[PDB]
Amino acid sequence: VLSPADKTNVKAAWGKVGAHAGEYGAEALERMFLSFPTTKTYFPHFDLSHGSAQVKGHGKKVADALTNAVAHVDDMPNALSALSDLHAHKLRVDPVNFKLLSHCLLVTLAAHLPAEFTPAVHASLDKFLASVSTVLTSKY
Amino acid sequence: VLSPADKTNVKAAWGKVGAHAGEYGAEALERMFLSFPTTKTYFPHFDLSHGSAQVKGHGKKVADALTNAVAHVDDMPNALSALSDLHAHKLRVDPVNFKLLSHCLLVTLAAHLPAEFTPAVHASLDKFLASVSTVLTSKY
Amino acid sequence: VHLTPEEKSAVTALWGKVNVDEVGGEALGRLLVVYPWTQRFFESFGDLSTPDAVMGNPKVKAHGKKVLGAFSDGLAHLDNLKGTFATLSELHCDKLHVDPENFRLLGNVLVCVLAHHFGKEFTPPVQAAYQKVVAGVANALAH
Amino acid sequence: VHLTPEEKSAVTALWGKVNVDEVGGEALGRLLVVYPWTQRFFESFGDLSTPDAVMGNPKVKAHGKKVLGAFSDGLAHLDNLKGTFATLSELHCDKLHVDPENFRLLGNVLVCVLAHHFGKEFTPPVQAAYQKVVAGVANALAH
Ligand code: HEM
Ligand code: HEM
Numbered sequence: 001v002l003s004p005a006d007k008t009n010v011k012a013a014w015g016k017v018g019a020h021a022g023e024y025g026a027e028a029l030e031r032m033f034l035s036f037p038t039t040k041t042y043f044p045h046f047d048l049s050h051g052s053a054q055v056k057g058h059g060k061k062v063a064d065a066l067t068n069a070v071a072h073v074d075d076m077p078n079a080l081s082a083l084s085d086l087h088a089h090k091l092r093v094d095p096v097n098f099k100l101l102s103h104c105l106l107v108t109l110a111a112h113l114p115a116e117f118t119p120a121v122h123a124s125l126d127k128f129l130a131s132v133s134t135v136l137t138s139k140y
Numbered sequence: 141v142l143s144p145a146d147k148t149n150v151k152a153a154w155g156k157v158g159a160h161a162g163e164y165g166a167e168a169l170e171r172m173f174l175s176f177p178t179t180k181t182y183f184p185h186f187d188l189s190h191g192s193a194q195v196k197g198h199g200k201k202v203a204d205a206l207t208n209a210v211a212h213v214d215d216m217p218n219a220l221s222a223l224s225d226l227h228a229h230k231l232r233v234d235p236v237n238f239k240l241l242s243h244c245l246l247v248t249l250a251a252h253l254p255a256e257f258t259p260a261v262h263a264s265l266d267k268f269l270a271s272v273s274t275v276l277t278s279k280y
Numbered sequence: 281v282h283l284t285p286e287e288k289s290a291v292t293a294l295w296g297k298v299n300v301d302e303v304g305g306e307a308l309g310r311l312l313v314v315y316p317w318t319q320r321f322f323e324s325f326g327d328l329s330t331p332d333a334v335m336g337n338p339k340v341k342a343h344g345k346k347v348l349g350a351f352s353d354g355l356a357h358l359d360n361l362k363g364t365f366a367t368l369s370e371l372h373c374d375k376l377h378v379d380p381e382n383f384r385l386l387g388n389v390l391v392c393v394l395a396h397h398f399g400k401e402f403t404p405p406v407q408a409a410y411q412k413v414v415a416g417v418a419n420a421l422a423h
Numbered sequence: 424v425h426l427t428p429e430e431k432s433a434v435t436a437l438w439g440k441v442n443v444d445e446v447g448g449e450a451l452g453r454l455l456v457v458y459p460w461t462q463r464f465f466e467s468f469g470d471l472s473t474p475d476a477v478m479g480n481p482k483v484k485a486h487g488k489k490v491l492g493a494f495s496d497g498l499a500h501l502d503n504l505k506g507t508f509a510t511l512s513e514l515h516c517d518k519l520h521v522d523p524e525n526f527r528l529l530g531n532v533l534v535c536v537l538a539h540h541f542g543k544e545f546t547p548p549v550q551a552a553y554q555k556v557v558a559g560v561a562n563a564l565a566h
């Protein structure tokens with residue numbers, strides 16, 4: 001259950017993320033693929049090399065989904081329902097992979113926005129990403 | 141995120157649990173203490189022997205909390221808020237202990253209600269207990 | 281896995297009364313139902329949509345028989361779990377890419393199935409002994 | 424922990440640029456803030472309510488210095504992590520009763536702190552090598 005304070009923190013953090021969301025998401029996906037190669041098994045049709053256009057497009061998609069989730073933080077199961085069906089019913093992704101991707105997103109945010117990455121913002125983003133991972137994993 | 145199907149499943153399962161809730165919760169606590177002795181560190185003032193009145197009373201308390209959570213399944217964050225503050229702000233309980241207690245509750249329910257413990261009811265109860273564990277662990 | 285002599289005696293006596301062909305399959309089916317993301321590994325089995333379709337799958341029953349056979353080997357050699365489960369650990373880590381948490385999940389589901397079948401006989405001490413047995417088996421597989 | 428020679432060279436060069444006295448305490452404080460249940464083990468450190476009170480605690484800073492020194496000792500002995508972290512594993516298991524998952528959490532927080540400091544210099548390959556290093560350290564502590 002997200003606190004009201006952490007909600008404002010994640011809203012401000014992703015607002016300052018702004019227009020670099022696609023590049024940040026592509027870099028987070030690249031970090032996840034490099035440091036957790038078992039996550040690559042969910043993309044057997046992809047080209048998972050460095051600078052891949054497919055990875056860049058998927059990072060853009062993930063970033064837009066995260067932006068929508070931020071904009072609809074109080075009604076996430078409704079806003080993210082098509083993604084929940086995709087990841088839970090069809091893809092059937094292990095939640096450990098969601099944890100790994102959330103960590104890689106946090107690492108990318110830390111590396112790109114040092115000033116914005118205060119401990120409170122870090123905790124808020126961690127809780128927000130955990131909430132997002134819960135909705136996509138759950139089948140309802 | 142729970143669905144109407146598993147909501148009705150957990151409601152029926154706990155309704156058929158009924159008046160044995162206190163002894164079921166006491167037995168679940170005893171199982172947790174016996175199989176996961178690290179959980180005993182949260183009760184240094186208790187007598188954690190077999191047949192203990194303190195354990196029986198705490199099992200009754202946990203069972204009544206589960207009953208009211210079932211009755212207010214759609215509004216858990218607010219119904220369980222005093223318990224959330226107790227477990228998260230004051231006691232600072234690791235969520236792994238919540239997972240262990242949920243497992244021991246499932247084992248007790250399996251051992252005492254064989255007919256009711258169908259795979260669908262088992263999955264519903266697992267998800268309901270996970271949701272309850274998230275609200276108590278979360279600080280908001 | 282280190283067990284007391286009484287715990288070992290209790291574990292073996294309950295294990296003798298276990299119907300392998302049934303309980304292995306229902307443990308696997310309950311795993312697939314409760315944790316639906318585990319059906320990714322068993323898509324080749326066939327119809328796994330509904331709980332009744334999962335629990336009525338002969339492929340699921342046969343694989344549960346194999347899994348319980350592996351579990352029984354661990355009970356026979358609790359002092360050499362790491363060497364007993366080396367080949368299975370290699371297969372699950374390098375060929376199947378199964379997360380080590382799923383081993384603990386399957387062990388807990390097996391404990392729940394044993395409790396379901398034995399009722400009063402599956403007392404809290406027996407459950408504790410079986411809990412550390414399945415924890416050791418999961419750790420051996422995760423190596 | 425098995426690393427390529429290039430990965431080992433990159434890990435060591437970044438480690439030399441690490442300010443131990445600051446980043447160890449930063450990682451410990453961020454752990455205590457992000458995962459507030461970990462304050463149960465450190466309630467003897469004084470005021471740990473607000474994030475700024477956690478990050479401004481000299482006891483937290485000193486304990487972070489010791490945890491980073493153990494991480495450096497482990498890094499110097501990547502081929503003998505289990506023998507290096509035996510006494511610490513005993514202390515954290517038998518005496519402190521800390522969960523194995525909490526050690527993985529602290530490793531991830533340390534990786535996040537390293538990324539926050541190095542920024543562009545931290546690179547996905549360097550991060551992957553450091554992830555393998557901290558995973559090995561956590562596994563050694565969890566033994
Ligand atoms: C916060 C976490 C995540 C978000 C916001 C997210 C978002 C998305 C989005 C927006 C799509 C595109 C759907 C479409 O175009 O119809 C997608 C597809 C996909 N996702 Fe995720 N995802 C997340 C986590 C994960 C993880 C951890 C994995 C695997 C380890 C994963 C595996 C996939 C796959 C395989 C696809 C299919 C893409 C394709 O076939 O081109 N997702 N996700
Ligand atoms: C999982 C569902 C749980 C429920 C429904 C639950 C419910 C409760 C209730 C109703 C109380 C009594 C509060 C009061 O009387 O003011 C309580 C207290 C307490 N709970 Fe839980 N609890 C759960 C999990 C846990 C776990 C897993 C632990 C530790 C491993 C734990 C540790 C405690 C402690 C130490 C107390 C204080 C009791 C005392 O001091 O007498 N709880 N809980």
Ligand code: HEM
Nearest residue numbers: 318321322346347350351376378382383384386387418421
């Ligand atoms: C935790 C204890 C486990 C034990 C004792 C065990 C045992 C076994 C055994 C003996 C086999 C060989 C089957 C054969 O030779 O035909 C096998 C294969 C397999 N295991 Fe497990 N397993 C465990 C956990 C898991 C889990 C949790 C999963 C998935 C979530 C899994 C996925 C598989 C798959 C996909 C196969 C291959 C099935 C096939 O080839 O048809 N295992 N396992």
Ligand code: HEM
Nearest residue numbers: 461464465489490493494519521525526529530560561564
């Ligand atoms: C990779 C992970 C970790 C490493 C390398 C590490 C390292 C250390 C070191 C070097 C000490 C000092 C021992 C001494 O002075 O004799 C220590 C003590 C301690 N650790 Fe950790 N630690 C880790 C994880 C954790 C975590 C996650 C927690 C709590 C959630 C924790 C709780 C403690 C406590 C309470 C002490 C004693 C503090 C005191 O005596 O003042 N440790 N650890």
